């Protein structure tokens, strides 16, 4: 009566400590736990199941002939591939790992992170989180990390397996869901926001999809290894280009009263004091960027911010203010 864990430990120790390939019969006779098999077929099935389980854990078993003068095949575990190279971690790196190990919430991601941290600590370095004294408050309200957790896990699994992804994506809640089937290339984060990068098989273009919009139905399809993304493609550059398209728009002169509009004050490039209509302030020449965003920013401050140029922006602000002052009828 030998437990399965003890049997697997004996098997892996025997494979690691033996410098020559071992056939099945020698393992049956020598390693404990394999001597209670009622029949040879039962032993073969048990050994195949145990070998499959060990191979699933990432242990690089190698199969080859026992000798150049013999035909029977044997088993051996390479010590070089089984052993990770040594790494030296400083206090800052240990603190970084300790802070990063307390982010995920899904059981699978938590288990994987715990196993990785355990292996890293067993490598020789020490990781401590109590010294830093930094915790996480929000655990179920994050729309980027907590909300996009299962989707990110599915995308990472598909990328590892090299398979295409089929999912439903909508540009906005007002719009309708659209089924999209693309070939994933990688995951790039920008300002703490995930952006899936891949090539669409329905439009034949490189698009970036925000993971918050994508639902949890990230079904992976296609044979493994069928995705071969070009190496010269820089995902970060594509994400940066997709984040912003207009470099600086145009130059607009805006007058703002002093002591307020600090958010707009920080965005000012050049400043010039000027008093108009008995109110002091400074005239600033700033960029345009998103026209709607600038119009909203100007209209939010009301009389605090007065637009001067261009005339189109002033007309738009005046129209919006008149619509607001109409009384809500329209």
């Amino acid at each position: 009566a030998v437990s399965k864990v003890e049997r697997l430990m004996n098997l892996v120790i025997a494979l690691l400590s033996t410098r020559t390939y071992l056939p099945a019969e020698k393992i049956r006779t020598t390693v404990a736990g394999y001597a209670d098999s009622p029949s040879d077929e039962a032993f073969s099935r048990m050994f195949e199941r145990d070998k499959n389980e060990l191979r699933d854990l990432g242990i690089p078993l190698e199969t080859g002939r026992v000798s150049k003068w013999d035909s029977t095949e044997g088993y051996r575990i390479n010590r070089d591939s089984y052993a990770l190279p040594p790494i030296g971690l400083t206090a800052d790196e240990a603190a970084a790992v300790a802070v990063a190990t307390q982010l995920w919430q899904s059981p699978e991601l938590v288990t994987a992170t715990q196993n990785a941290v355990l292996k890293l600590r067993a490598a020789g370095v020490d990781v401590d989180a109590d010294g830093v004294g930094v915790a996480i408050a929000s655990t179920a309200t994050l729309p980027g990390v907590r909300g996009s957790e299962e989707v990110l896990q599915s995308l990472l699994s598909a990328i590892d397996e090299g398979r295409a992804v089929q999912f439903e994506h909508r540009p906005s809640r007002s719009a309708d869901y659209t089924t999209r089937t693309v070939e994933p290339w990688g995951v790039v984060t920008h300002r703490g926001r995930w952006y899936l990068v891949g090539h669409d098989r329905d439009r034949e273009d490189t698009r970036t999809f925000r993971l918050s919009r994508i639902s949890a139905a990230a079904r992976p399809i296609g044979p493994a290894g069928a995705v071969q993304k070009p190496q010269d493609v820089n995902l970060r550059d594509i994400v940066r280009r997709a984040v912003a398209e207009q470099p600086t728009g145009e130059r607009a002169r805006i007058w703002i009263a002093g002591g307020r509009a600090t958010a707009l004050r920080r965005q000012a490039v050049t400043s010039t004091p000027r008093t108009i209509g008995g109110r002091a302030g400074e005239e600033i020449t700033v960029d345009i960027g998103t026209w709607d965003r600038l119009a909203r920013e100007i209209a939010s401050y009301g009389s605090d911010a007065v637009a001067l140029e261009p005339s189109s922006l002033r007309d738009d602000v005046v129209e919006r203010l008149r619509a607001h002052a109409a009384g809500g009828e329209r």
Partner: protein
């Protein structure tokens, strides 16, 4: 499964015990995150398994000195098991997500960790990658905040209050750093108002270090990690506003409540506001896209502000 994880832990225990010559029971339990009985059972199971042939000088042997653990024969177990693809990918993703968060971790340390892990596992450019090779956007305030947190020293912060649209300089003692959503907030005790407030890194222009190592009151009274006294309270007024179909920008960046769908756009929602002026600015920003319904006083104030802005624009040139 559970058995696979137990096997991995039992196989990796030996290198961990070899790394620390005299690791005690408490340190091992904390490192492995298991109870005392479970650790004892795992140690017993690992004790009686080793080299084939099964000789007492061949299998794994320990040396118990009181309540200490030491390895005398590793039986070929010299290095820990390698890292699988899933766990390495998760660690890299977590590190690259936390490197961009200001103040939670030093970017240099995160980059060094990423480089060392990639070198150890042999990853290539086909993995998750960041956006900026070198940020260089930190004004040095985050480093000062981290130093103040570590050394428990007085810190001066010039925080911009968005609700009141003003710059306030306060002297606070850092307590802890927490992450809420995608915006990390610094928790500290301010003697100016005698209350706990959360400050965001992007709203701090600069930080000044002072040599006043004074223990904050909350550690001596109450040091709850959350302390969300005003994050969500019934006393906060709520504004009911009509949102158009075109103005879909606010549906994601703000917590809209009581959302009702109407093809004609006759159904509205309700959102809380910290200050009346902030809500007025938020309403005026969208223009005609957002229509005010309730309360009547807020609508009257918005109309008066719009009329004043129109008069100011007419007077100005």
């Amino acid at each position: 499964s559970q058995v696979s994880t137990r096997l991995v832990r039992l196989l990796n225990m030996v290198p961990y015990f070899q790394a620390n010559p005299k690791v005690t029971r408490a340190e091992a339990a904390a490192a492995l995150g298991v109870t005392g009985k479970q650790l004892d059972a795992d140690l017993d199971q690992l004790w009686m398994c080793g080299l084939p042939g099964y000789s007492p000088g061949d299998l794994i042997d320990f040396d118990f000195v009181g309540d200490t653990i030491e390895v005398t024969f590793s039986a070929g177990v010299d290095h820990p098991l390698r890292l699988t693809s899933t766990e390495a990918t998760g660690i890299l993703v977590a590190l690259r997500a936390l490197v961009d968060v200001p103040g939670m971790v030093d970017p240099e340390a995160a980059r060094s960790a990423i480089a060392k892990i990639e070198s150890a596992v042999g990853s290539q450019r086909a993995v998750v990658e960041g956006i900026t090779e070198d940020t260089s956007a930190e004004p040095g305030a985050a480093a000062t905040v981290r130093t103040a947190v570590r050394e428990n020293r007085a810190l001066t912060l010039e925080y911009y209050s968005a609700s009141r649209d003003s710059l306030a300089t306060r002297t606070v003692d850092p307590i802890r750093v927490v992450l809420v959503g995608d915006n990390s907030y610094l928790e500290a005790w301010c003697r100016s108002a005698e209350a706990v407030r959360l400050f965001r890194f992007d709203r701090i222009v600069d930080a000044q270090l002072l040599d006043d190592p004074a223990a904050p009151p909350p550690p001596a009274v109450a040091a709850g990690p959350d302390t969300s006294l005003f994050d969500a309270d019934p006393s906060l007024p709520s504004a009911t506003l009509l949102i158009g179909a075109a103005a879909a920008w606010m549906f994601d960046y703000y917590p809209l409540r009581d959302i009702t769908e109407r093809p004609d756009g006759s159904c509205e929602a309700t959102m809380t506001y910290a200050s009346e002026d902030w809500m007025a600015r938020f309403i005026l920003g969208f223009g005609a896209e957002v229509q005010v319904l309730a309360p009547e006083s807020l609508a009257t104030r918005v109309r008066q502000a719009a009329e004043a802005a129109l008069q100011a624009y007419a007077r100005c040139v």
